[PDB]
Amino acid sequence: KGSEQESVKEFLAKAKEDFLKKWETPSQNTAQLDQFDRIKTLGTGSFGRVMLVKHKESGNHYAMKILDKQKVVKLKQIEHTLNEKRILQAVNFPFLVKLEFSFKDNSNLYMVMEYVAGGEMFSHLRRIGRFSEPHARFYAAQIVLTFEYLHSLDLIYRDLKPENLLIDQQGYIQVTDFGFAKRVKGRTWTLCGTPEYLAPEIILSKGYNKAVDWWALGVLIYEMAAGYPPFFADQPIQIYEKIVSGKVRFPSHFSSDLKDLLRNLLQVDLTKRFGNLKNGVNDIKNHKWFATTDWIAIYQRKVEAPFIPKFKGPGDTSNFDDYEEEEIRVSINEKCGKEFTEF
Amino acid sequence: TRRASVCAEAYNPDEIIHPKTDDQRNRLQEACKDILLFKNLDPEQMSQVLDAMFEKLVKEGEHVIDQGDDGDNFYVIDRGTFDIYVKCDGVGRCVGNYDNRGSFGELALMYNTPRAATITATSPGALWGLDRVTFRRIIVKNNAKKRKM
């Protein structure tokens, strides 16, 4: 029934056509650094950080991810970085952050995305402790639809986690960080993601597909409902040992339906894992835990959000943690030009 | 705390023997039996991995690994004594002593991250090492031949 509510056949067909067209035609240098006023850092990463910025001519606020080219080359992330920008600029979905501009200079790569002021789901989850099943379900439904979309384009997201899920002003999810997103038609092999969310097949280099995203969803749902991930330890190896074992313990307050859904998503045997069976995503849309889910209302964003972050106005960064600031210096010599031409 | 992503070197297969005595191989296999990435290997992969592990001779006072450095190798002790210390906020502390047995650098087999400690040989010793890239190429090339779907 859940899967019979909305007809997505022609939608996914057209979405695929549009994606392919844009994927092959990314724009280059659609803006420049001096067209933005840097206000504050929203988050930092290995290649640099994401800053809240104001477009000087329009006055609109955006989130600009800055990636140090030399660092990207050193950490051997050239391909991933090129994929991140090429894929993000080509996708379009209600729950995916939009890339507004991109450009590069002698030192860095820049991705200017729409600013999602609500903050990371991570901060809200850690403050609230744990979400009610209905609250967790609201977010889960959005991810289910997003993966159906991404997977239909033969893309794998590969880094689902609360830290990469932003809450917008209506309380809906905006997926960011396409750092590991990749076009995959068969199987891929890069060991990447975030420790607590890695599927067994990634950890063991068995080769994997979109099923790893469904596993990650299981980890996400569990963490949202429990307040902590299913496989946790103070050291990475211990985390991985637990993941490979797959033995999961559910809090006593988890409903029978939730436990059943999670046992099927956190299935160590990818061939028995929900989202990867004959009925694909429908097995998830039709699961009892989502019985009360109105998939149409979710996609159209008409469902009332169980939680909405506080907002003062444009530029408000109160929902994000504070980070040490630093001026952006651009070298007088072009760095790693050859490797980033496509950007 | 916010969790950062991890990422290893890519190797799309779809797109190395270090002589050891039977005794050496048996002891080495027995030392990696509890290592996560080894326990999950098929018998043929194990054999190929064991062949790839190289001997690392060390002199007393020599630093096997220095904390903070990039890690690309996993090590299993064959013989010798080693010290283990970690610098925390500037304070150096000993976290124990190795006595002819043990292993370290396990995480290096998955991806590069700064070494969490410095391990120095406190006497003549010998270790068996395994490079992350060499390891990955072996497992991935072997698994790439497996049919799926």
Ligand SMILES: Nc1ncnc2c1ncn2[C@@H]1O[C@H](COP(=O)(O)OP(=O)(O)NP(=O)(O)O)[C@@H](O)[C@H]1O
């Ligand atoms: N569009 C956006 N609007 C607001 N904040 C954002 C946006 N995109 C990213 N952020 C914030 O900036 C942080 C860093 O961006 P992210 O793309 O996740 O960096 P990263 O280096 O790829 N992190 P990771 O790979 O997960 O270790 C995010 O966790 C958010 O807090």
Ligand SMILES: [Mn+2]
């Ligand atoms: Mn991230």
Ligand SMILES: [Mn+2]
């Ligand atoms: Mn990332």
